[PDB]
A paper describes a structure:
Triosephosphate isomerase (TIM) is a ubiquitous enzyme that catalyzes the interconversion between glyceraldehyde 3-phosphate and dihydroxyacetone phosphate. TIM belongs to the family of α-β barrels proteins, in which 8 central β strands are surrounded by 8 α helices; the strands and helices are joined by loops. A peculiarity of TIM is that only in its dimeric form the enzyme exhibits high catalytic rates, albeit each monomer has its own catalytic residues. DTDA is a powerful inhibitor of the activity of TIM from T. cruzi.
On the other hand we were able to obtain crystals of the complex by soaking crystals of TcTIM with 1 mM DTDA. The RMS deviation of the Cα traces of native TcTIM and the DTDA treated enzymes was 0.39 Å. The data also showed that in the position of Cys118, which is far from the interface, the two monomers exhibited electron densities that fitted well with a structure in which the sulfur of Cys118 was covalently linked through a disulfide bond to a thioaniline moiety.Thus, in TcTIM crystals, DTDA was able to derivatize Cys118; however, as shown by the data on the Cys118Val mutant, the inhibition of activity by the compound does not depend on the perturbation of Cys118. Accordingly, and in regard to the inhibition of activity of TcTIM by DTDA, it is relevant that the enzyme soaked with DTDA exhibited significant and rather unique alterations in its dimer interface. One of the most notable was that although loop3 of monomer B exhibited a conformation almost identical to that in native TcTIM, loop3 of monomer A acquired a markedly different conformation. In monomer A of the DTDA treated enzyme, residues 66 to 70 and residues 77 to 79 superpose quite well with those of the “normal” loop, however, the region formed by residues 71 to 76 exhibited a significant displacement with a hinge at the level of Thr70 and Thr76. The change in conformation of loop3 of monomer A was accompanied by alterations in the contacts that it establishes with residues of monomer B. In native TcTIM, the side chain of Cys15 of the two subunits is well defined, and their N and O atoms are respectively, hydrogen bonded to the O and N atoms of Gly73 of the adjacent subunit. In the DTDA treated enzyme, these H-bonds are missing. This was consequence of an increase in the distance between Gly73 of monomer A and Cys15 of the other subunit; in the treated enzyme, the distances between N and O atoms of Gly73 and the O and N atoms of Cys15 were 7.9 and 9.2 Å, respectively. Therefore, it is likely that in the crystal, an intermediate of the overall conformational changes induced by DTDA was trapped.
Residue numbers in the entry:
A (entry chain B), B (entry chain A): 2 to 251
The structure:
């Protein structure tokens, strides 16, 4: 069915400093987007306060790049509740860096999404297969297992609050730029699974963002793929050209 | 022989609300002490900007509860460089909870430590054995190995920026504090190993802090031990009680 509202998400990973982010916030604030788009910026936890105080572009929400499910005895971590008290209502969960370096299993990701959902958060749930998994011809088994692991914790009505980001981790970890066709190939199969398990309604309204290598140069040809509803952008989202990335979802 | 400057460090862990921390910080600002003590407060990353904005008590420094080096996965994480640029120059590293839930090995803690030191941080390096380790007669072996891993990535002139916190895992959030003697016995072990590697001057100057169910009701009896130089306080750090604990380092 016809495309739902696009999302342009920035993952500011753990870069930025007041020095870098201020001029970058100013640029996004000066930009006007005439179309229906939800922009999302995910600053590091430390930078979320200056981002919230400074960010004014009306299409934008501020996200967290991660979170744990409960407050209490967890040194170094930030909970969903603490984020929500602060007025943060978006969070990225399941990012490939978290799955791979930080021991976030399908179950761990799934449990965080279930809780963020019940805490009233919109969630960008990340999914993606490694080079080793792709080459074993296990792309579909892996992304659909990550996806079904999350769906098992949720009900029909959760999905108005869920967004999926496809991370082509096979391309990221091999220094490749996936093609619009490679991206679309996996977005299509994620959507086909959603359609069959949750409904055509759920499937039509679901945003599936592409979390590969996104530049002002490729943004528009990625967005013209049938099942791409936007982006989770890495490096380019810390640059003025993020404005042109947003524009490409028009 | 005589004890170096004590430290009273608050670990806020995964707790907070702006609603809670404003009055707390106001109290801390009004607290006045008659002896030389380094106070440290370690908010969540999300709460570090509010604390830096509001804390004026000049006996106090702000610490992060954790950080990564330049060579970690950044998503969800906050780097040593990012903190420094924020003006934060204290960091708690190797906390039990992170060694236990977030897979930080002895090597990883060591890297973070060495890196934090190179960047100008004062580092509170945490160590401590679990109940099962203690039961198997492994306390020394465990804590000296955790310590030794750190020590080997450092040089003699690093030690002026290092602080050990001994937290027996069995004393974290259990109401079971190490009797003065159980703690003394371990602080002694640690200092004595420091002395074998680094000599008289280093060993004498190093602060070893006790962590694990510190309250206003037990802190003074602990601080009386010869090898205890203050505290890393968890639940009680988020109460007016923490002032009384600082006073107990007199």
């Amino acid at each position: 069915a016809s495309k739902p509202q696009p999302i342009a998400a920035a993952n500011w990973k753990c870069n930025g400093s007041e020095s870098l982010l201020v001029p970058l916030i100013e640029t996004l604030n000066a930009a006007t987007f005439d179309h229906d788009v939800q922009c999302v910026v995910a600053p590091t936890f430390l930078h979320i306060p200056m981002t919230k105080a400074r960010l004014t572009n009306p299409k934008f929400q501020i996200a967290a790049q991660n979170a744990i499910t409960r407050s209490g005895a967890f040194t170094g971590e930030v909970s969903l509740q603490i984020l929500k008290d602060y007025g943060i209502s978006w969070v990225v969960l399941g990012h490939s860096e978290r799955r791979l370096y930080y021991g976030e299993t399908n179950e761990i990701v799934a449990e965080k999404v279930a809780q963020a959902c019940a805490a009233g958060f919109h969630v960008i749930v990340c999914v993606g297969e490694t080079n080793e998994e792709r080459e074993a011809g296990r792309t579909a088994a892996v992304v659909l297992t990550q996806l079904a692991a999350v769906a098992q914790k949720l009900s029909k009505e959760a999905w108005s609050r869920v967004v999926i980001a496809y991370e082509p981790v096979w391309a990221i970890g091999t220094g490749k730029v996936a093609t619009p066709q490679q991206a679309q190939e996996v977005h299509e199969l994620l959507r086909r699974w959603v359609r069959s398990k949750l409904g055509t309604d759920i499937a039509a309204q679901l945003r599936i963002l592409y979390g590969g290598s996104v530049t002002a140069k490729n943004a528009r040809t990625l967005y013209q793929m049938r099942d791409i509803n936007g982006f989770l952008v890495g490096g380019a989202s810390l640059k003025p050209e993020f404005v042109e990335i947003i524009e490409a979802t028009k």
